[PDB]
Amino acid sequence: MRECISIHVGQAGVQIGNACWELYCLEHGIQPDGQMPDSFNTFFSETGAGKHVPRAVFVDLEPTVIDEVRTGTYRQLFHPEQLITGKEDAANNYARGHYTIGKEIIDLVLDRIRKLADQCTGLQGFLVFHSFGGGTGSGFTSLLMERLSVDYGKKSKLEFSIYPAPQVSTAVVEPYNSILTTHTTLEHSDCAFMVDNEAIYDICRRNLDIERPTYTNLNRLISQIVSSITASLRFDGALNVDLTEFQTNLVPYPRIHFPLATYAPVISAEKAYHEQLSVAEITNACFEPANQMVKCDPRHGKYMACCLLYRGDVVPKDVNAAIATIKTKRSIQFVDWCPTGFKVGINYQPPTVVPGGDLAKVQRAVCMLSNTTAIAEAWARLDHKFDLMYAKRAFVHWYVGEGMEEGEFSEAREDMAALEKDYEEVGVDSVE
Amino acid sequence: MRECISIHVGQAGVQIGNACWELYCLEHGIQPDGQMPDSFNTFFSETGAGKHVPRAVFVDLEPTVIDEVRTGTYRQLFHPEQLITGKEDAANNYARGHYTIGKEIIDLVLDRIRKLADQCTGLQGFLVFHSFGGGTGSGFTSLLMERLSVDYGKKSKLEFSIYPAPQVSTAVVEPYNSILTTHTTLEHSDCAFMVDNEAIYDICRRNLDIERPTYTNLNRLISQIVSSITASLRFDGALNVDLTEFQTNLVPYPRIHFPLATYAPVISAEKAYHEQLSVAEITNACFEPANQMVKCDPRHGKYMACCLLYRGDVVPKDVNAAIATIKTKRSIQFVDWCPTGFKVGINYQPPTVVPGGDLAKVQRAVCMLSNTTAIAEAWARLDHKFDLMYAKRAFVHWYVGEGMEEGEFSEAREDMAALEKDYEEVGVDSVE
Amino acid sequence: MREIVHIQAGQCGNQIGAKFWEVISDEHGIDPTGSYHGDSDLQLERINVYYNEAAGNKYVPRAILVDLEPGTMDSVRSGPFGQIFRPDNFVFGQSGAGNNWAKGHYTEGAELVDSVLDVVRKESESCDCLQGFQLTHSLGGGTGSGMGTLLISKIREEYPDRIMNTFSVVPSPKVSDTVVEPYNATLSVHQLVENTDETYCIDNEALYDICFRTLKLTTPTYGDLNHLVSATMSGVTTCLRFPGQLNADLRKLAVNMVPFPRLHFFMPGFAPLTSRGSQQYRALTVPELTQQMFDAKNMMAACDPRHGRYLTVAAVFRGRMSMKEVDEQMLNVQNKNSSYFVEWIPNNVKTAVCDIPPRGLKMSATFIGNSTAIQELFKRISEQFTAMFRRKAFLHWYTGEGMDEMEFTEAESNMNDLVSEYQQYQDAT
Amino acid sequence: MREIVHIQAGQCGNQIGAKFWEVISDEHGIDPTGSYHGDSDLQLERINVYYNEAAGNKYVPRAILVDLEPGTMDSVRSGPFGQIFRPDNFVFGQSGAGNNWAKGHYTEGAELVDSVLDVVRKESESCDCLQGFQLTHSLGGGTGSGMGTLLISKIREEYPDRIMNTFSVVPSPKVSDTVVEPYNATLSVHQLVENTDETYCIDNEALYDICFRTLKLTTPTYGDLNHLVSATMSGVTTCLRFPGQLNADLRKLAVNMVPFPRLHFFMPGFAPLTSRGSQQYRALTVPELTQQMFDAKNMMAACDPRHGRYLTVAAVFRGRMSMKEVDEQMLNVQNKNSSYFVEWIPNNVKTAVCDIPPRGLKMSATFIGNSTAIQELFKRISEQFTAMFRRKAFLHWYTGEGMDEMEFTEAESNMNDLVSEYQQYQDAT
């Protein structure tokens, strides 16, 4: 009844959803054929037969990552008109995602969204999975978020982005694509959840004791995040939280809407024992700076709003016993104007484990969604990676020749400079 | 008891009926031998034995397409005096269909009609299947519709024409044959249903996922149209509609009687799943401009009368829930003088699937018959294709030498110009 | 029904037809004797158009083979498939035309033409409902030019409502094969414009290129050229002899392709044309057959279509194929080459699809092109005519046979009345 | 989708491609005939990029093999995997370039280039959505330099939005293989900077070291050198033909590696490269494949990267491997060699991982390096050019073929306009 559709843009967006829709089918007993041998209605529309299909739009400008879904295990699950392919990728070109190739199938994608929104009766919002590095996840998403705010406007549009790491990069023009995609998604997206690869590389090595983590394994941890956010919709909880409540509790200013996700417990099977995992133990794990999933130091900043989404065997008095200690600790400091920096959610359902997964079966979990000042250090790097490249006008002819103006980069950089001084304006205390 | 005979003119008319009478025999359990191991009386007269024959007149001026029926699967079905052949075709010559060759067997065809009309006790009207391109479907039909209005007059004569596409043509003198056949069929035919090949090429490629559609496959979709129009006669419905009701609800002016058909759902077997196909889903498919079967843009015009013919598992309250939303939508606009632009029909029987067919088994269907202003763009092309050819007097000696006057083209063009300004007179709003 | 009487004139018209009745007998499964030996009843469904049924379950070709010397008929009746013709149909003289139009049309042709038309009238009354007559001849020879165009003027007076399509081998630009071929062509085109409903200009220079370039034949004989002509000839009437999904005939190709009654001079094309090795390295699809037709190097008339505009285009296809795949490609060549088609005929592409393929092929095409590009065919001949006639060269071999100079002055003016019409509708807007 | 038309020019470009289509047919499991004989459907999933599907379940390579003498094509069509090409694609002349750029670009090249582009336009329209054209040629020869760079200037005018990557065998520092190779190189680099989106400089001296030092081959033939070139060539488009965990293509390698549109001259590298005995004594891990690339002795362009700075670096990996193990090593070489990478491009390492390994290997890498180290490649040639040109030596073999001295003055100034740009962005802060 409280339906929520999802969009998957770019190669990063599809491979995340390949783990997410793997995870959702195990939480509801759903076969890969759509079979199951009433709470699943928020993601699964029902057919006339006993077959359920997901409310998902997989879009890419190149057909390779889509065809592996079309030939993979989940061939029989997805509606084949939802698996949208272009011909040529945007190919790490924001202009090709936004002007050249993206305009060719943007009317096809909005058509598939509008067919999903008509069969939804209580549609809450959107889950856009993309990245900041690739041209599709930057250009086509920013083209798409322009169109969804025109057609809907008041729906709560959520993004789950793959933020580019400080020292770990896979593409050279990642500083170009990330600045350009944020200048457009700023006035449109309501709350964009940053996720970094290097921090999950830190977590999969240390916390999971995996020597060699794969992109299969990183997408499992992002799936546990998005499942725990929509756990209160898909299941009955002791204290529920809707997607409309997240943008209310976490976004103090319309510019600052970039929290960073954090999941706990992340332990292997050999460490599934040897600790009891109380709600005090898993909550102190989240505010520990080594366990976050964006490479930022929260001790170098201040939290503005934290959102603890518990699930499973969770006792609400022990929740308050866990949380009230953290406000006393000096390493967790808040901003002066925010005495109430907490939103707490509890679900009765534990997170299940995917077979072949690296996480272990735990009785309780927590998905921290914390908006902090410490992300301003991440944007201070990314402008510094931008200002070194753009001063020599590197790679600009790849973007000018695809329809973009050279003066548009000065618009995106000065606006990002205006976004950078917003955290400095919020991060200071109040006079008198 | 409510009998309705059908006439099939030209190679297009016969090959449509080869799928139509294939379809009717499967809806009534009729073997190709006329056997079945009381509602079929509207098309099948009964013999003394347990053998039923169709009320059909197949006429062509060349014997090739008739002899394939005489040697095909349905040899034992048809009365061999109804399979009328000439010797030489009209051969894309309207004058040879109307003056030279058509006069030779027009008295034979009217004799076979009059033998069918005598054994009908409640004869409602005619179903003339022809095309606008061929000389037989243009010349012989226009000769025939002159004679049936003389002999009957008050019977409701319906045409199912193959309208020539804007960019897809099979013959060169299609602009000549289409203008000449419409000048004659205007004052005689009560309601002529336009069908285009290029739009079914669009539907068979996109909606059916067929790479290579055949004229076998295009005639299946036209058969599903004509079956769903006569579904209310041949079967008992929750809200029935007779052929006399179609000309009443859809023809506001005696000149404008050219609706365009639209069928839904058109989905394959792999897309038979993955959607639930409500009556809300299949009704929004019809008013979508990509799913119509004449290459016209209804957003460039206004609907004058729409006729939704539902069949199968259809609930009449959900019908009103589907239809009342469409009047609110901006892309569907009506003419100012028509607040009630709808005729709704519901049958209890689902459309069955022909084995070897490309459509899938669905629980419900809809045959939209919508008269719109957007067909005036189609006639504006066809005069423009006429005015370029006729100004150089191209191909006129093929028509003058077969008995036609050169001044008769100026009569047909000025009359079509008078028909073109009729849509401009109707398409405007009312003063005060 | 719709029967066709095949007439052959000249040495060339006999050698084309002797290969043509080899193709028709292989399509219908006919033995060297005349008896049916195919597999399906579709071959005998429309057997009557090119065959009369004789007694004893044998079929004879409805063919009338005309020459003025017995040298070619003895090659026909003694070779393969020569024992299938009726010996009454071989109407040959003794004197020979002497490669002369006047000896073919006035002196030796008129001493035989009454013995031909009585065989024509015998075959025409044996037809149930006659479709029309196809004639195979040249324009460079004496019998095919003289006796051939004498047969057309006598038949059109007797049978005016029937179609009269000729397969005229038009002479070549680079080489000649006859010194007086500008005289034989221009005096025949005078007779073709008034009495033929359509005419298929084939050039031997163009078939020399197609056998060399396209088919990769280093040593092509006449039997290899005539198999390419007969593949067109059977491909024109393949929808009349077999069921198709869009049937055409000789009257559909007449009405659609002749916008003005003089301008009925066509260029044919055939596809696919592949070598022995180069056929397994190619996918036989409808977009491949389409782009093979509309270029320059597959035209059997030696003129580049890029020098002019197509007036009308017919594409008769054979074999099981899909109509959208056809109708997209017929649209596709009209969009990218909109300057190459004439503008004031919108959608100038005739489509025909026969269900029965040729023997040993999956699908095949037969191109019929009516362009202004054959004005250079008649600009060249009328230049070669006027260069010879202004010195009155070779005039006494025609003046001695009953002709005056006024016959040449009318025939040369008639061709310049024809060239000025193709130039008129090329510059037309 | 995203199909590639492979073009070969020169004797060198044919002998590379004849080994290159040996590798591609082994990766996709293709027999000598052209039929599929692999095991998985992943080989046929993206078969269409380098192959057209012919009738009878056979695949032909989408290759256009161009030469000016028939000596090399007869070696191709008679050797192994020569019966797989279409015989229409072998477009060869008779005169031969004579190891001359002017005879390859003006006189004998222009008499063949119209017969090549019609095969290019035939293969381009057979593509569904064209990705772009890859060309294999040299810069020392006459056909690969003349006819090759003539094909680029004609294609870029016809297809401007497509990528045009060339695999140019650049001449060597120590030895020459052509007396007029400073003339053939500089006149070709004039055509490469204006019409190619990227260009992979390979040197034969560098492959001589890699076969001797790294692979321990005492007697390497050309067939052993070209297997190292083709391992790079298949490794560039391996993410386009197979699923990967981070897919790249020819446009991702174009945008990431070309910071300025002239500076698109790359050096390739391949890893692993082991001997027969020395392969079981080595662990094939991602840190081993990483450190094998970024040194000097694995560069296929004969210049030490330590003399300059890497502008941009692409590392396309093959086989199942872990991304952290990749992303640590791509970081690890940037920390310890921060003076060796350019400073004002932070994080200048492009990463690509394909899931499908090469045949018989567990994992493999393909290095694409864009450094300022190839300014010494053009400092050497422009010095060898100016030494020959100031005496006007060998000028009359080009002046006699339609060229003036102004062509050399522009081409030499264009290369010194290129050397001054690599020197500009090496000293840039």
Ligand SMILES: Nc1nc2c(ncn2[C@@H]2O[C@H](COP(=O)(O)OP(=O)(O)OP(=O)(O)O)[C@@H](O)[C@H]2O)c(=O)[nH]1
């Ligand atoms: N977390 C996570 N990130 C991924 C995964 N796969 C790719 N990425 C990220 O995707 C980013 C590049 O964007 P892509 O999705 O690969 O490219 P794209 O969005 O399709 O745009 P194109 O350049 O046109 O291909 C890289 O920086 C990776 O960090 C994955 O499996 N998990």
Ligand SMILES: Nc1nc2c(ncn2[C@@H]2O[C@H](COP(=O)(O)OP(=O)(O)OP(=O)(O)O)[C@@H](O)[C@H]2O)c(=O)[nH]1
């Ligand atoms: N929808 C549909 N149209 C067809 C089919 N077959 C032929 N046509 C149409 O028929 C038109 C030509 O008319 P024909 O029926 O072939 O010719 P005719 O009416 O017999 O008149 P003649 O020229 O004398 O043969 C073409 O424009 C085609 O669009 C078919 O199977 N389905």
Ligand SMILES: Nc1nc2c(ncn2[C@@H]2O[C@H](COP(=O)(O)OP(=O)(O)O)[C@@H](O)[C@H]2O)c(=O)[nH]1
């Ligand atoms: N295509 C083709 N043309 C031929 C053949 N034999 C002769 N011709 C042409 O016929 C012309 C000569 O005409 P011909 O019939 O021999 O003279 P006629 O007997 O007096 O009519 C020459 O221009 C030849 O090009 C042949 O086998 N095939």
Ligand SMILES: Nc1nc2c(ncn2[C@@H]2O[C@H](COP(=O)(O)OP(=O)(O)O)[C@@H](O)[C@H]2O)c(=O)[nH]1
């Ligand atoms: N890598 C490689 N280079 C070659 C091979 N054969 C020739 N070359 C190079 O090609 C250059 C000569 O060019 P070539 O193609 O023979 O001259 P062309 O035919 O006129 O273009 C020489 O500098 C050689 O270094 C080969 O098998 N492998």
Ligand SMILES: [Mg+2]
């Ligand atoms: Mg991608």
Ligand SMILES: [Mg+2]
């Ligand atoms: Mg017909």
